[PDB]
Amino acid sequence: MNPIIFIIILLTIMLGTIIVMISSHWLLVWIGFEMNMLAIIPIMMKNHNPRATEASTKYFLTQSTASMLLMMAVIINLMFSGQWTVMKLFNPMASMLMTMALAMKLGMAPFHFWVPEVTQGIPLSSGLILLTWQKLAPMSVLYQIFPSINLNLILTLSVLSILIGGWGGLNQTQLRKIMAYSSIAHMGWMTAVLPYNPTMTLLNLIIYIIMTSTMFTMFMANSTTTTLSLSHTWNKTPIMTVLILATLLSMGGLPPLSGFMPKWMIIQEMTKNNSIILPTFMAITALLNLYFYMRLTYSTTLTMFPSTNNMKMKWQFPLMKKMTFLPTMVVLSTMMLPLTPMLSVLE
Amino acid sequence: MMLYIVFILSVIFVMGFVGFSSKPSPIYGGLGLIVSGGVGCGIVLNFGGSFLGLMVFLIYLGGMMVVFGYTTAMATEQYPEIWLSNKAVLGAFVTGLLMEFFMVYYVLKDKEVEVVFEFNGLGDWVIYDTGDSGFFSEEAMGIAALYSYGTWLVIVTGWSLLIGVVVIMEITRGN
Amino acid sequence: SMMKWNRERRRLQIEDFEARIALMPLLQAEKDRRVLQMLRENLEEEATVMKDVPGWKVGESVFHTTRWVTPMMGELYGLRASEEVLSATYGFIWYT
Amino acid sequence: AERVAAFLKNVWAKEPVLVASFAIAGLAVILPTLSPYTKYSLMINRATPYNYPVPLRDDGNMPDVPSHPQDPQGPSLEWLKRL
Amino acid sequence: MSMVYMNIMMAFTVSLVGLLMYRSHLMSSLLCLEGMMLSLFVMAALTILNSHFTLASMMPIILLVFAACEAALGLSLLVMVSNTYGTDYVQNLNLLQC
Amino acid sequence: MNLMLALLTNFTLATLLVIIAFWLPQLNVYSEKTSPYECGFDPMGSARLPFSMKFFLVAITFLLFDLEIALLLPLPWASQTANLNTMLTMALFLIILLAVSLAYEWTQKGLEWTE
Amino acid sequence: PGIVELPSLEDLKVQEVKVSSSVLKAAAHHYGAQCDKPNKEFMLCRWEEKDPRRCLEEGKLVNQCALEFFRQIKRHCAEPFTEYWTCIDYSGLQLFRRCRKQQAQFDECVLDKLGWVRPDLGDLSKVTKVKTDRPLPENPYHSRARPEPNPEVEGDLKPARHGSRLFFWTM
Amino acid sequence: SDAPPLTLEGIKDRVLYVLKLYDKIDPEKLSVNSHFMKDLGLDSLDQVEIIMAMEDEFGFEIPDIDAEKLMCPQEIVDYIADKKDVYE
Amino acid sequence: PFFDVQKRLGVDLDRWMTIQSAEQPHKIPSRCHAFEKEWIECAHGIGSIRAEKECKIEFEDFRECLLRQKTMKRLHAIRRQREKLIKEGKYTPPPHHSG
Amino acid sequence: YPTKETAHWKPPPWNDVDPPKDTLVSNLTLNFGPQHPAAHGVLRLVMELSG
Ligand SMILES: CCCCCCCCCCCCCCCCCC(=O)OC[C@H](COP(=O)([O-])OCC(O)COP(=O)([O-])OC[C@@H](COC(=O)CCCCCCCCCCCCCCCCC)OC(=O)CCCCCCCCCCCCCCCCC)OC(=O)CCCCCCCCCCCCCCCCC
Numbered sequence A: 001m002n003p004i005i006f007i008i009i010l011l012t013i014m015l016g017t018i019i020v021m022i023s024s025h026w027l028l029v030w031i032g033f034e035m036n037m038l039a040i041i042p043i044m045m046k047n048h049n050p051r052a053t054e055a056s057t058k059y060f061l062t063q064s065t066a067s068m069l070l071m072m073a074v075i076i077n078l079m080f081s082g083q084w085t086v087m088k089l090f091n092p093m094a095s096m097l098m099t100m101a102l103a104m105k106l107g108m109a110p111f112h113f114w115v116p117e118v119t120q121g122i123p124l125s126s127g128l129i130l131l132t133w134q135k136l137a138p139m140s141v142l143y144q145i146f147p148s149i150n151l152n153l154i155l156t157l158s159v160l161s162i163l164i165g166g167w168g169g170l171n172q173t174q175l176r177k178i179m180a181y182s183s184i185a186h187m188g189w190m191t192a193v194l195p196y197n198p199t200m201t202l203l204n205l206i207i208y209i210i211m212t213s214t215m216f217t218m219f220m221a222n223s224t225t226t227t228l229s230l231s232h233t234w235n236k237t238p239i240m241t242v243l244i245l246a247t248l249l250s251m252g253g254l255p256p257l258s259g260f261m262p263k264w265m266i267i268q269e270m271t272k273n274n275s276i277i278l279p280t281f282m283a284i285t286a287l288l289n290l291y292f293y294m295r296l297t298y299s300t301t302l303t304m305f306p307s308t309n310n311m312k313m314k315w316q317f318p319l320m321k322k323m324t325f326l327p328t329m330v331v332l333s334t335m336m337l338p339l340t341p342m343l344s345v346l347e
Numbered sequence B: 001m002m003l004y005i006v007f008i009l010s011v012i013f014v015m016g017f018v019g020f021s022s023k024p025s026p027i028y029g030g031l032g033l034i035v036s037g038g039v040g041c042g043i044v045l046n047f048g049g050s051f052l053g054l055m056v057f058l059i060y061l062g063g064m065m066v067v068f069g070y071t072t073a074m075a076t077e078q079y080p081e082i083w084l085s086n087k088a089v090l091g092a093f094v095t096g097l098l099m100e101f102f103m104v105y106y107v108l109k110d111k112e113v114e115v116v117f118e119f120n121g122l123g124d125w126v127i128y129d130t131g132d133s134g135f136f137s138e139e140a141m142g143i144a145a146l147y148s149y150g151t152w153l154v155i156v157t158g159w160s161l162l163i164g165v166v167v168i169m170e171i172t173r174g175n
Numbered sequence C: 001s002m003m004k005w006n007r008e009r010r011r012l013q014i015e016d017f018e019a020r021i022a023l024m025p026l027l028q029a030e031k032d033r034r035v036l037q038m039l040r041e042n043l044e045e046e047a048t049v050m051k052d053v054p055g056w057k058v059g060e061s062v063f064h065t066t067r068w069v070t071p072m073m074g075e076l077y078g079l080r081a082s083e084e085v086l087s088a089t090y091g092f093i094w095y096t
Numbered sequence D: 001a002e003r004v005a006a007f008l009k010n011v012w013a014k015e016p017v018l019v020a021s022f023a024i025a026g027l028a029v030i031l032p033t034l035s036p037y038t039k040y041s042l043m044i045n046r047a048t049p050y051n052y053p054v055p056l057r058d059d060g061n062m063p064d065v066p067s068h069p070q071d072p073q074g075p076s077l078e079w080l081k082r083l
Numbered sequence E: 001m002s003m004v005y006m007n008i009m010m011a012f013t014v015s016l017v018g019l020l021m022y023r024s025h026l027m028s029s030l031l032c033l034e035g036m037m038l039s040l041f042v043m044a045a046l047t048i049l050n051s052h053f054t055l056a057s058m059m060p061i062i063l064l065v066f067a068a069c070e071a072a073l074g075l076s077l078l079v080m081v082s083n084t085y086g087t088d089y090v091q092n093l094n095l096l097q098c
Numbered sequence F: 001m002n003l004m005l006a007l008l009t010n011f012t013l014a015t016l017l018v019i020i021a022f023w024l025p026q027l028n029v030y031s032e033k034t035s036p037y038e039c040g041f042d043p044m045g046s047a048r049l050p051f052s053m054k055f056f057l058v059a060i061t062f063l064l065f066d067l068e069i070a071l072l073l074p075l076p077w078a079s080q081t082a083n084l085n086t087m088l089t090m091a092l093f094l095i096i097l098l099a100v101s102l103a104y105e106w107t108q109k110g111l112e113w114t115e
Numbered sequence G: 001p002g003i004v005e006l007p008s009l010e011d012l013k014v015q016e017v018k019v020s021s022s023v024l025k026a027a028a029h030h031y032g033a034q035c036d037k038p039n040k041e042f043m044l045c046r047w048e049e050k051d052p053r054r055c056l057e058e059g060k061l062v063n064q065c066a067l068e069f070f071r072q073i074k075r076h077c078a079e080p081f082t083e084y085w086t087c088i089d090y091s092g093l094q095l096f097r098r099c100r101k102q103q104a105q106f107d108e109c110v111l112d113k114l115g116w117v118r119p120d121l122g123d124l125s126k127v128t129k130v131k132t133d134r135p136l137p138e139n140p141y142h143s144r145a146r147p148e149p150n151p152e153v154e155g156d157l158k159p160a161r162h163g164s165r166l167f168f169w170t171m
Numbered sequence H: 001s002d003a004p005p006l007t008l009e010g011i012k013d014r015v016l017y018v019l020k021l022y023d024k025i026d027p028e029k030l031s032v033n034s035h036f037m038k039d040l041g042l043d044s045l046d047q048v049e050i051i052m053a054m055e056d057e058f059g060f061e062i063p064d065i066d067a068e069k070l071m072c073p074q075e076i077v078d079y080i081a082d083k084k085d086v087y088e
Numbered sequence I: 001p002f003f004d005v006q007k008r009l010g011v012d013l014d015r016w017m018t019i020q021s022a023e024q025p026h027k028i029p030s031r032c033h034a035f036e037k038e039w040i041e042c043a044h045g046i047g048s049i050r051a052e053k054e055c056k057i058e059f060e061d062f063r064e065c066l067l068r069q070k071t072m073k074r075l076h077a078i079r080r081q082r083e084k085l086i087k088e089g090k091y092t093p094p095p096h097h098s099g
Numbered sequence J: 001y002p003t004k005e006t007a008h009w010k011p012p013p014w015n016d017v018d019p020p021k022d023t024l025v026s027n028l029t030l031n032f033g034p035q036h037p038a039a040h041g042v043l044r045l046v047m048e049l050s051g
């Protein structure tokens, strides 16, 4: 792809996301989603192999179907209120359609089957845009319609995501499906606290983005897309093995690491509303996530797996990839817990 | 009768959707979406919007022509299917028809059918406005407003179409 | 040539629109009495069709406000002639 | 000054249709800015009376608003007639 | 809601159910996506026209514009699907998660 | 009404001529008469086999361009606005982008049919 | 929510004007100048009241000037006028431009017999002021009292007491 | 699930069943050790047609050099085993 | 908006089409202009939670002007009663309605 | 965790590229004669067309 075309396509994805965020009209919000979906497919098919085609085909079908539901909700809302404003919906049936539509775009269970698949079929860089930047727009609409979202609908999806997300990743050895299921489980925490306090939804989304971005960047540095492939890193970049350990521990929510902050603040808000059972179930169920994060550390940092003879040839070359923002992201993804009260800036 | 032209056209409108939703060979599926496109253009027309009704019909005629040329290339087999040549396509086609028939039966008799929403069978004509407009078409004025009022809509729509050309050139390049 | 004729045509249109403006006050007055005459006729007949219904306030509004609300086609032509209604609803759209 | 007339003469001998396209398109985007009658075009549109001119309540301090349609006060289309 | 709204919303559901239930052809499921656009177009046009929402009269036109940017996009992948396999059968898109 | 009658008349007239065509003549049907025509020899394979489209990329572009007429056909009404400065700018902006779309596909060998 | 108060059939009865549309179009320019006051006074009522029932009285006076307007034409310019609007009626679009000859004969008769002067182009479109003793309606929308707003928060800002007060953080 | 493994007794039924369908072999005196030419009287081409059925039965290609030696049903069962590595 | 940039930069991108009582070409009013105006003016500033209770009348009237459900039910009842009375030779049509 | 079902699943290609498939689509075959205006009456020109 001509380097000029790559930037213009990238700038259209951001423009689609930015249009959804600044719009005050249900029509533009839909246009934003369509513009984003238009310019995301080519990035998936930037290599033209059969797995990229399947991923793009599956991704297009799911999002286009979701868009039809979102536009249908907008029309029913127009009939029952006679206005296009991006605010609380004025009909129970439209809110259900919009909530399911947004849940389809986010990948929350039970509309989750595509997330493991699309990520596996696209490059690591493409997956980073799919699992971090593609949640900003669907989340900025839930942030504005949460008063009208049904309570039982939204929480049910979150409890399903944290369960489906936790169990799915236990069985995976591909790094692009471990992160695919890690994404689904984290969507559950974001949408579980939305009814109670949308500000904590943003905080859980910001920490998720940084930790996810840091993980993908370190995968791209060594060009590793399997569990075994990542097991040879101790023989090339030992400093890179430790960073993966710290980031993976944080993603599991272990204190005193940044990945504990969003879980810690979510539990507080739910309890203040007399919701004791649900946070307890969510917290325990998250031990599933921590388990298959610990297997990566065992195979990556805490033990030395068998190597290959040709590995000795790589010792003589430097790491030439960009690894942009990696040193900053790694720090922010492990050593932010002492600055927890800074979350007030999100309000 | 004549007062129920819009309702009759809408019945035919649904029958076309049941047509291609059964998924026969896309040749016949494309035919169904052309029949519903035509009557759908009629319903909008009877509500006052003639430019809108003709536009959608015109745009779908062109689009379904490109689908036809693609069907003979990527979506064809030795024995193209019809609504009678499969039990799945036949079972689905008769299913959608009966479900439309029972809705027309109950609405025309009971006069009030509630399925998610409450529907009234008195007749579409009972809600039309009574007064006249001025010396212009109201819908025509709004479509003309796209340029004087819709500056932001033109820019995104123009930009999106331009990228659409660029995007399909990348996807279909292959190799 | 095309511009002068078009320019002449804009002046003709104004002379056509002004003539309409001089007449609208009379047509508005006629339209008002015509609607009110028909609303009463619908009200008068309803009195003889709901004379026995227990829970029925004849001529009761459906809105909370007392403002004037323009009647819809169903109200104004409740039980008028069948062909009168058809031309009232689809008379303009079908006239070609 | 010697290469400007070599590109133009090369395209004019290979792409005569494209030259006529850009040349025509250029005048569409330029001439409206330079025209002196473009202001009249916008003024004629405002002069077309689509709506009804709803009158005003005479509070007694509106000397710029006419009392009759045939009074000196108010905008005149004299410029239109002579145009 | 008049009796016409029942048929347009009934039509939208038929297309929606048609889309979710694939048979074999990918082109057959692309029409259902275009069918859903036609339902939404009509339903918006009736709502907007009926209430004399003048400025909203441009919404259905804008709707068609992105209605076709999907069809164009959808057909683009169909070309790339049939190139790899020679037919647009959906059962050939089973390399992922299997 | 008047339109409906005209539409109903034109297609009824055509149908009668089709009915007359099939029921007036004397017929003599047998297998070899109704076989497909391929210049005197039997066809090799069904006419339902795939038929490659060497202009598929030009066909897709037609969809995107065929939308511009939807956004351009309002121009005769648009010219009547009092805000001609804005309307003039956007009408040319919309058409100019369409040309840029054409010029991009043209230079990139898009309009060239494949082999 | 109450009964809709409507006038009786006696309250809506008035001597109607029964001249076809071709007649009004041919005589609208002189009608828009002679009967300006009685019906510009009507349209102001109609817009301000926003209620057909509140301007019926002004509506009757519109028919009065309109009727007396035609009686004047019927008594002086009866013949030249009937020739005029007959020509306009012939066309399906009722075009002025195709009847300029007969217009001159009608403009000269009214000008000589009645002194009427045709309005100039762009006159009838003007916005005019009309003096009326009718009081300006209050609350024409019959709107209830708006809800009282939320109290405003006033006072100079001060730093939060003891800081964020988040669990154990001392700032 | 993983299909049942091929066993030398499973192959034997397949061969005899295929031979049973053949209309030139008399089912009475078709033993697992009977000879195609001498015992059953089949000619060369008759032998070639049987080998073609076996290819359809087990879905793999048999070269002509090998089929020249499959002169009785036993070696067919042996040959199939050697290809699928069914030592059993 | 998630990011209310328009308010910051003072540029109207899409608020001109949000409501149907906004300024329209040639001052063409919508059918339910008066009702949408009152609901919006009743419910300005107090916030959504209050407007859900204090401006409930102005929103039910608006919702009636849109879908006209409470009106069609009334007409439906009259039609039912009328066809019953006219079924047993008890309803005499008034002249204008038919003749 | 291998099961009965996932016993046969194979690891994806190292570089994500699967082998291209074998002969899939055949050129259409057409008789351009002998009863053709341009076949001079007696030319059976058997052609293989791609489109
Ligand atoms: C860091 C957290 C602890 C990490 C340990 C692991 C714990 C993990 C679990 C996390 C648990 C939650 C968070 C901790 C509990 C905090 C709860 C709380 O209430 O916060 C109150 C806390 C203090 O409030 P306070 O009780 O009212 O006043 C404290 C004293 O009165 C003193 O305040 P002051 O205002 O009167 O005097 C300031 C004092 C600084 O304050 C202190 O150091 C002691 C205050 C600590 C409070 C007690 C916390 C318990 C943990 C003790 C940590 C030991 C810190 C000392 C480490 C050795 C360095 C001397 O002296 C100065 O440094 C002068 C000001 C320097 C300004 C710098 C200007 C910009 C230049 C920056 C250059 C950066 C260095 C470049 C390196 C170049 C090397 C060649 O405020 C905070 O919220 C900040 C929390 C983070 C503590 C940072 C303290 C160290 C800052 C320097 C970094 C040195 C490395 C630190 C170890 C990190 C290694 C990974």
Ligand SMILES: CCCCCCCCCCCCCCCCCC(=O)OC[C@H](COP(=O)(O)OCCN)OC(=O)CCCCCCCCCCCCCCCCC
Pocket (backbone or CB within 6 Å): D022, D023, D024, D025, D026, D027, D029, F096, F099, F100, F103, F107
């Ligand atoms: C205020 C806004 C108004 C401005 C609008 C801005 C947009 C302008 C473009 C819109 C129209 C889209 C066309 C843009 C692409 C220009 C054409 C092009 O790209 O040609 C590239 C061409 C590639 O072909 P190639 O294989 O290289 O064969 C020639 C070998 N040298 O290689 C070439 O030969 C390139 C040669 C240079 C091309 C110059 C094109 C000039 C276009 C502007 C002409 C205007 C002047 C005439 C009008 C003035 C009034 C008379």
